[PDB]
Design a protein around this nucleic acid. Structure first.
Ligand SMILES: [Zn+2]
Lengths: 239, 69, 114, 52, 91
RNA sequence: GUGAACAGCAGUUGAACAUGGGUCAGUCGGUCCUGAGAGAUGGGCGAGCGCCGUUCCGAAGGGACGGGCGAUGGCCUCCGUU
RNA sequence: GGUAACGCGACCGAUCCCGGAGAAGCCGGCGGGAGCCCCGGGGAGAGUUCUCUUUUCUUUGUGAAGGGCAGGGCGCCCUGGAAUGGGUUCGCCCCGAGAGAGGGGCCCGUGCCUUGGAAAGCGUCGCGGUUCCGGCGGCGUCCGGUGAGCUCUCGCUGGCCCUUGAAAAUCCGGGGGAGAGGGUGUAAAUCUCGCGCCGGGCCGUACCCAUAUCCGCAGCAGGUCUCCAAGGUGAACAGCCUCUGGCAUGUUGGAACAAUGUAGGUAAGGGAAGUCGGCAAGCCGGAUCCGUAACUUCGGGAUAAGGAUUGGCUCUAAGGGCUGGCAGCCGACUUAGAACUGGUGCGGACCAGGGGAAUCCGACUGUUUAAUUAAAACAAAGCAUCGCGAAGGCCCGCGGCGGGUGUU
């Protein structure tokens, strides 16, 4: 597959939740907005919420989409800035907060308005800070510690909607509508049952593999199917 | 269509400039006067025959009077 | 049994096709078109789901034909916000204004001491 | 047009027109229906031009 | 009278999809069907709208909470960590 | 009106042949708009008919409330005026 | 005008800002209002009338447009503060953040009648024009309560989603006061109130919608997108007989009744012993009542396995609204019991379960080689790991910071 079939179907999902534009009011000041209402957005598992601000130069009722945190209510004043206090639901730079702070919607670089760790029940943990040359080590939920230049800003708290994948799938009738809403790649067919003229692992009379599933990283398209550069396999023993 | 209640409003309607043609419907125990204005057909239901006979003489002469059968 | 037929060219069960039954003066049954009716206008607060009374819940193209007092009611914030939320905003206005007066008195005392 | 039929009849024959209703035949010709006022009779204006 | 012996809200499913799986799912299903007490009013009116959202009947105030439950133990520990960091900043 | 051919025989009849009539809207639908999608064009690529894209590197509002100054139509009074 | 929901007749007002309709999933239950049906009496037409029959059937009113009255919903504001806990649904929920008791008030009213409107129309009887004539005259165009009857619309409430159920044109609603108006009257401006006058371009409007007008070489048993849907029998939009409407047996007619073909039934006695193969074919069949094992993921088994009953005529008992512990008047269907009696007859034609115990595979609903295989095939609920932090994971490409994943 290349496209136009396996893509995710996005019709009722309108827009994306972006972080507020940086200025002097986020550099060396703070400003207050209100929480209008929260709603479960289609497509995304985590719900969104309307946060109404105002422009300091203009007079249009602005609004901003943020990820809804766990344990928050509507009709609440949210402060944002460098000089803001420490509470749940507050975006602030990393150089002001101390170490060991559970944050989400983190930026890998200052300017992209929030990319890292903002899915359903995910948060990156700041390990330690560095005052000289503005460095910060942040452990990602995978386990790797990334170095961030401490110019970005991030909200406080975990994302609402945690523990969604703990319960197994009840029935294929629910699964068909869920994957029909998400993306049309649910009838997963085995490559042995597939034809050998298109899929490489097909062919033969009996149902057998007969070839090593490990594959080199340097491989062209069509061949690159399977465990991609598998160091080990089987049951994970220990860590 | 609309109904004129009083005799004075019916006279002021009949003395208008755009009065096309009035008609008289003679059924039992009632005399219905129907004047044809531009927008509505204004009607007057009189249950008293003597008052209707007086009103028929009280019609102005400059109006198309017709007794519908 | 009135085995009726079509009158227009639209043949399918369309949601735009809304008719009603009525008796003709000619002693026969045929449909008549129902006019499209909308909902009552909701207040601009949002916290109160109770819609306003005294306003004809109708298609809003009729509002060009309606009169001024037929559109809006003779009340402050007429046809935009209910009087409960209006007086709640007035109470919040007076309490936050008196709180700002108390903050101004405390700021004057802070400038008097230090 | 329906007003152009009215102006074309009013310029030539000098007669008033109430309304104009037109169709198009399947043979490929337009068929109008000119309504006359009752002061000028249609049979009389046909006898003036000669047709019957 | 006594309706069932030990099966509950999964008893409408019946013989399907195993016993231990339905026994595991039942604890989440009872927890989501049982409404919780609000903090503003206190009445048991918190109705489950969707994932990560809760609607109140009395106060009519949307509260963005957990997916299946209302408040998680992880959220309690996050609130305690925010309290500890606030006290550490205040000194 | 007709009886050359058809209606698996049949026909005076028929969707058969030839001359003519027959569809009338301010109030009925299209016309106005957008959805899935297509697509001109800034820009760039391509020897080449042409290709990517729907804001994407752009000198992107030809619209308008009011004030002043010369001029016209109706005693330049007031308005469409310029 | 009123404490108020709100109303009356016009009752100003820019840029800009805000909000609403537009514009929203499915299902279950309940209530109200209409249409079509049901009945008694009264009228106009006909059939039955060897016999009886107050018998049988056709029929009995009103549009758009303005207003009033019913009748519903009220999460709409006041007098007052309730646990010995109250009002209340088919079900529930609510309540010192304000229940029951009391007064007003807006929203929809398609039900009633009034203007439209009896003039028209439907019949009966007579008078002409031999005819051309919205011809002419008399009478009717009713009196009432109901019903889990069928259909439509509206309102209330709950459940389901790891799925949250569309955008655009359009309009008025709300703050807002820079400006336009004037000196006491025939004031100026302002008019969304009742009016009066003139027009609203262009395109199409005929027929069928199917075993003769669409497609299949054709009067082609095939495919074929939608609306309207009487009475009895009956739980039934199931099956059968009749009402309205349609029809003259579908590329032919007559004659006798050979064998062998096609579709049906009936068959003394045994009852799968024939044949790879109870394959085909046949039996049981519904309702009520009693009653039910092995194994078990305790949910299924199960209608387990099993038994008794199935008419006519004529009675008894039980369950409701209105008015003034109490009496009268209107009453619509169900259930239970008894005797007489029919040639053992009764789900008298239609509808109309085969089970019980074992072995192997696959959980199963579902997709499937148009046209030889529907299954143990696939989709599959669960589990296990591989790579990747946008300077990259994968795919496409001839190219442009190329596109998809990524609205991530
Ligand atoms: Zn609360």
């Amino acid at each position: 597959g290349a496209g136009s079939v396996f893509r995710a179907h996005v019709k009722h999902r309108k827009g994306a939740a972006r972080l507020r534009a940086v200025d002097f009011a986020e550099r060396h000041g703070y400003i207050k907005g209100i929480v209008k209402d929260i709603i479960h957005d289609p497509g995304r598992g985590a719900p969104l919420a309307k946060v109404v601000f105002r422009d300091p130069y203009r007079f249009k009722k602005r609004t901003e989409l943020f990820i809804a945190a766990e344990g928050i209510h509507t009709g609440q004043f949210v402060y944002c800035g460098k000089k803001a206090q420490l509470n749940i639901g507050n975006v602030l730079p990393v150089g002001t907060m101390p170490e060991g702070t559970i944050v989400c919607c983190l930026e890998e670089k200052p300017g992209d308005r929030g990319k890292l760790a903002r899915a359903s029940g995910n948060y990156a943990t700041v390990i330690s800070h560095n005052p000289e040359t503005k460095k910060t080590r942040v452990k990602l939920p995978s386990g790797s510690k990334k170095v961030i230049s401490s110019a970005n800003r991030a909200v406080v708290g975990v994302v609402a909607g945690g523990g969604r994948i703990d319960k197994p799938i009840l029935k294929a009738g629910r699964a068909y509508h869920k994957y029909k809403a998400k993306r049309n790649c649910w009838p997963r067919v085995r490559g042995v049952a597939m034809n050998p003229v298109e899929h490489p692992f097909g062919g033969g009379n009996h149902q057998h593999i007969g070839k090593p599933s490990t594959i080199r990283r340097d491989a062209p398209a069509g061949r690159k199917v399977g465990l991609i550069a598998a160091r080990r396999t089987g049951r994970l023993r220990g860590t | 269509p609309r109904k004129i209640e009083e005799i004075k409003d019916f006279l002021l309607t009949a003395r208008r400039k755009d009065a096309k043609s009035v008609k008289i419907k003679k059924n039992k125990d009632n005399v219905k006067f129907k004047v044809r204005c531009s927008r509505y057909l204004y009607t007057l239901v009189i249950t008293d025959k003597e008052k209707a006979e007086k009103l028929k003489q009280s019609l102005p002469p400059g109006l198309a009077v017709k007794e519908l059968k | 049994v009135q085995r009726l037929t079509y009158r227009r060219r639209l043949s399918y069960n369309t949601a735009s096709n809304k008719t009603r039954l009525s008796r003709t003066p000619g002693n026969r049954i045929v449909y008549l078109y129902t006019k499209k009716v909308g909902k009552a206008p909701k207040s601009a607060c949002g916290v109160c789901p109770g819609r306003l009374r005294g306003v004809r819940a109708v298609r809003p193209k009729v509002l060009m034909r309606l009169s001024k007092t037929k559109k809006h009611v003779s009340r402050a914030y007429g046809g935009s916000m209910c009087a409960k939320c209006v007086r709640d905003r007035i109470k919040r206005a007076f309490l936050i204004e008196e709180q700002k007066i108390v903050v101004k008195v405390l700021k004057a005392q802070a400038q008097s001491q230090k | 047009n329906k007003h152009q039929i009215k102006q074309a009849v009013k310029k030539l024959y000098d007669i008033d027109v109430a309304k104009v209703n037109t169709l198009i035949r399947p043979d490929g010709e337009k068929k109008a229906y000119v309504r006359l006022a009752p002061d000028y009779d249609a049979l009389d204006v046909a006898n003036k031009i000669g047709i019957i | 009278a006594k309706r069932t012996k030990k099966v509950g809200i999964v008893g409408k499913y019946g013989t399907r999809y195993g016993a231990s799986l339905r026994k595991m799912v039942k604890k989440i299903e009872i927890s989501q069907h049982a409404k919780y007490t609000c903090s503003f009013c206190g009445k048991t009116k918190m109705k489950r709208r969707a994932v990560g959202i809760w609607h109140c009947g009395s106060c009519m105030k949307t509260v963005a909470g957990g997916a299946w439950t209302y408040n998680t133990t992880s959220a309690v520990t996050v609130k305690s960590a925010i309290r500890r960091l606030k006290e550490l900043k205040d000194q």
